[PDB]
Amino acid sequence: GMQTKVINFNDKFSLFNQHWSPRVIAEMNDYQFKLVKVEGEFVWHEHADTDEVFIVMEGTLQIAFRDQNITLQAGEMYVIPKGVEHKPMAKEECKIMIIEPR
Template sequence: MNEPIDIADKLSQFSDHWSPKVIARLNDYEIKAVKLKGEFVWHTHEDTDELFLVIDGELTIQLRDGDVTLKPGQLYVVPRGVEHCPVADGEVHALLIEPTGVVNTGDAGGELTASYDDSLG
């Protein structure tokens, strides 16, 4: 039988920003813990929605038609194909829920593309 997952414990095991870590799996989806700070890159996920659930801090998701700001305990789903850019003024702890294999920078690529990390799962 699986043990409960302590999200705070998982988040305490790493310090890098914009590098999601797989902490659990649900069917064909991964639940990823991530620390965010600063501005990410504008990008799109053409084939999937992307769920952001803020655990600590305040996250703004910039959208071309208006921004969404999330506080702890709030979530937002960016619909597939919608260009977005997360911004965290201070450090934010969050969970992402997305299909297995989704690349964090979507179609943008670049230096902020995280390597796949399931070491915490």
């Protein structure tokens, strides 16, 4: 049945504990919805050809930009415009969802 394809975020987060390792949970056209557990600092990087979306599901995420840091709480999102250098970070474990093209 179609109900089996209803995705529960909490159920999906329970399946892995590894950090900085996105899990694809759904596809929409040529885009993917990915769950990630993060802690500590990522690296400075950019996506030259696409905007990237961060939705915080649980915890507190920071994203460093060249002149400022932004803070995202649970129930908040941000669109990183294409070509913009950034470095995601989390003081404690943070549960996020990323949406971007395949």
